[PDB]
Amino acid sequence: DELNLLVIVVDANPIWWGKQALKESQFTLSKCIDAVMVLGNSHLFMNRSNKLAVIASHIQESRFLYDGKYELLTSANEVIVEEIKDLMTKSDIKGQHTETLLAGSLAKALCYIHRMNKEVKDNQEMKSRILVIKAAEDSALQYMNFMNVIFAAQKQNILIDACVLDSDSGLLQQACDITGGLYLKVPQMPSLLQYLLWVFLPDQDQRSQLILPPPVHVDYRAACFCHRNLIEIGYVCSVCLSIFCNFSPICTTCETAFKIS
Amino acid sequence: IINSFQSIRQEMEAYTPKLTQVLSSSAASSTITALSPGGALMQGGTQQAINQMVPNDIQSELKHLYVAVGELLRHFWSCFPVNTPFLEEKVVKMKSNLER
Amino acid sequence: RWEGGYERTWEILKEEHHGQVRLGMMRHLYVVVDGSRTMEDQDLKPNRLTCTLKLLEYFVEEYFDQNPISQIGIIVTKSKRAEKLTELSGNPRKHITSLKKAVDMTCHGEPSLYNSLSIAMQTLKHMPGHTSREVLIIFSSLTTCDPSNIYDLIKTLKAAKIRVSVIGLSAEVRVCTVLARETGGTYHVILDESHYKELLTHHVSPPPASSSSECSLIRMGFPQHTIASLSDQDAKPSFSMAHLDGNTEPGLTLGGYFCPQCRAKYCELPVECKICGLTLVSAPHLARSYHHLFPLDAFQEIPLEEYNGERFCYGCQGELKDQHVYVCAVCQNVFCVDCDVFVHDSLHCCPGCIH
């Protein structure tokens, strides 16, 4: 009855992969796609009850991606390749939006997980986890919405695993710390698949007996809106929760004067 | 930037999956070494038994001192901030008690 | 004279978001539960006590989920007296443990509104003005014993700006209605366990802020998880203050959370500092309640036949066959019933709006 779902979100920002391609490094987007497909095939291999969900995170939208080889594996790989080529071939940069819709892809993944769980019969319990690979830079404006995702997963007790390739994201670190998922940056991009298999492939119960690298240290500093500097102790607004370094009689954000006689 | 985007778009527009190129034993060996005990990913390692390093009587006395200093400083911070002249003498007495 | 004649031959025949208003950013909630004889009644299976305590644990969980910087106090009124079962604090595990322990309580006597309210007021008499003072009471029996006048206590509570909410079980009580109305709270009647859960969920959300409520610039500190490693020579363990006041061995950890104001060490968050009174929180805790500041408006329900657009859900690609399809207000996307319910209930954000 153990139904393991491993939703994989792929950072499919064309700009970062173009930068990497111009660098002519050993690792490209094709290798990333191949590693993701192999990991998903292995996940489906480990048990019949296991399910695979692959969604590509792109700036324009979040795409639901899904001869001597397994029939279902071959069909799934064909579908994934078809969808990714259809998206990237028609991926026309129209606008200055560079940050990928990371939050939207996570929200769509959570909706898909909820729909699967509703479709899952009471006879079986569907353990769910999400693995996200980070390649491009992190986004700022999504932060709040990103937070809305995190607790939501913690609402349904879903692990969130982060695989940073190039650009670190403290948001991902905090999400992994909160939801209990694993955060780790790949030192050598060509070795990505083994990092996926050795660490992110086993389930948490399997991870329980397994010995794994300790989680990275996570900080929780704050930005003082008037200057957005690091702050240890700050003045918290009781109206709109805006934080200030110095005492103020009127809050800039809530526009409500602090009635301190 | 748009040129790089077009370059990668054309590069992955005609894409074929690969299997041998996915991983190599040398890369596998490096990954194992990183994941090996004592590796960079395996931060630190074993630690020391702090419990045996301090007697339980010393631990209990430390608890007593912690509670005493905590209550003293709690009263100090309760007096703070000094908004009345009476609070100055009270905090001075608090500091004297802390010193004693 | 029914014996004249009778045959069964003929029997044998073939056949609720309000406006963008200020809410309870900081709440000091006290829960008072009756322990009278009537708690053993079977209004809710198996009895009032078991269902009440189970739903109370669920309420505590949800309330701490949606109110990170709040507090919960548990008081049990039985035998015309009140017992301060649990102190006002923010630990969910301790309160759940106390409720599980009290599951085996002795339901006897009658509730005493006066004593319980007096104890709650005395506890909340020194609370800061900015923090809201809200009390929730579960009333099983219709009779209360008052060692003094009750309306004077009502006047004192109103002067203390302490909100009182009552959720009964039997029927409406005039005194409870007056108490709820005068102090600004709400009085509700349980129809079943489902209605009980609905009322508890409605009470989970922060109440609308009163006009007289103050708006002060409170000062809080945000320490990090300073973990000391024995590889460092400065790995000096110290018993946590929260764990120190415990029967078992307090947690003697090398590192943890150290107060930025008085260097007090705490192994659990979010916990207000015992020594200097500093409210030690974390950045996610503040952002955890932002959905209250920015509620998600209900989507437009349109019949599938009258919806002349796409036939797949935007959130799950589901082939929409239901008679009702929910369209977003902002980006006007296509969502099925399941996604429409879940996003508003849990996600609180429309992905298309983010896009």
Added chain:
Amino acid sequence: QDVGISAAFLADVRPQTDGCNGLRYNLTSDIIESIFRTY
């Protein structure tokens, strides 16, 4: 800690007639105080 006056302090309170001819009054201060307040 003050206890309100209950109307059942008479009917509920009975002289405990233990089988071995025991007249356990179980004289308690609160019962006597309730009697004094009521009567």
Added chain:
Amino acid sequence: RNLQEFLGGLSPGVLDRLYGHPATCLAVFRELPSLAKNWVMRMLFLEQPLPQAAVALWVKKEFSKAQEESTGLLSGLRIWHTQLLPGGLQGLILNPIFRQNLRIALLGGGKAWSDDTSQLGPDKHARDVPSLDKYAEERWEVVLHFMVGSPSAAVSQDLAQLLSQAGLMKSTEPGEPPCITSAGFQFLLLDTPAQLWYFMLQYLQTAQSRGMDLVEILSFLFQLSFSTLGKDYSVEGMSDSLLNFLQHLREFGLVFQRKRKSRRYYPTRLAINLSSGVSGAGGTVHQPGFIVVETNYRLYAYTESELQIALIALFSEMLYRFPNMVVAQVTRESVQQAIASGITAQQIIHFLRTRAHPVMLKQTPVLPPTITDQIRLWELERDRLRFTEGVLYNQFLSQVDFELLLAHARELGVLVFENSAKRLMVVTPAGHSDVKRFWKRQKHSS
């Protein structure tokens, strides 16, 4: 005995030959423990041996028991093997043939196991999935009907020979049908997946008798297991031994084929789960229970086939026979007779629980506990006395000599029972000779 138990008992060469088939690799990997699966995936691309201590350091100290269990299971299955690492060390490395075949199965490449059915186009006489399942049920019911001895089931004589080799029916009198033995009786009450699994285990244990490649048969069985129900496959490309084995499977109904010359074949859900044996198929939507068990030891059957009638009459006295219903009563007499026939009470209880009518499922216990306990008590009362043939040693004049002889006999492991207080004991007839000789030799040495 599960599938892995039989695989763990085969020769290394058979395992190596099986590993050549990607489907076999997939089956073996899927049947591994979770920790074993994780280790295999880790070692999937490791071209160098792994130090044994390094492998052991990966798991929790507390889970070292399960770690070693998985390690020994993998070693016995010969998925991996130990290698003489330079310096005297012992590394671990997967089988290169098995590893390559697994990579082909997973990564892709290589050659497909069989050609697609589109070469012959659509089937002229195609069937439906419910039709295939019903046909398989009919075939198995016919097999069991022949096992009963009813003249309705006229099956192949080779099938009867196979059953006899399995020992189910002994042909004491040639020409007359063989009489079903006690083991056949026990098999008769097994669940249909269990019945098929036991029959296939016997066939495999007797695979060499027909001159058929065990490796090829196992590979084809795994391919059937991973096949898709409702889809046919190409008969061609298989050895004549495999062709006759497929004919046998068709005779059992596990695979449907309209004509012996037909190049298509439809595997059945029974065949699909046949590899899993008894477990794995947790969602078996069995036929509705038609047996009502009343507190007065009465069974009511909503059935019409003679097969279930015989199954019920095996342990109950038939009373009435209606067209759609059979009224029987479970007595001490009938249950004791069935136990004398070799059937264990647990088999009857489990069978009744299996064929439980939906009405009785509403009861929190499936069946009245009184009846189950009564059946258990009848089974016990059958075996109340204990019989053991042996030799009595009772002429012990010394306690020290008795202790020494008892210790020596326990060393020989031939002790039946001992009584130090009376210095009396009983020994096996086989172990009697050795103990007697030792006693005489020690008397001589005295």
